[PDB]
Amino acid sequence: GSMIHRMSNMATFSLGKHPHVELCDLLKLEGWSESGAQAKIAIAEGQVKVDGAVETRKRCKIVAGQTVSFAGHSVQVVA
- CATH number of the structural domain spanning residue 21: 3.10.290.10
What's the gap between Cα 7 and its chain centre? 20
For the stretch 18-25, contacts whose Cβ atoms lie closer than 8 Å and that sit 24 or more positions apart, written own/partner, are 18/63, 18/79, 19/61, 19/63, 20/60, 20/61, 20/62, 20/63, 21/60, 21/62, 21/63, 21/77, 22/58, 22/59, 22/60, 23/50, 23/57, 23/58, 23/59, 23/60, 23/68
Domain that holds residue 41: 1-79
Amino acid at 26: L
CA distance 40 to 64: 25
Rounded to the nearest 5 percent, the helix, strand and coil shares of the chain are 20, 25, 55
Are 38 and 29 in contact, with CB atoms under 8 Å apart? Answer: no
Number of domains in the chain: 1
AA letter at 55: E
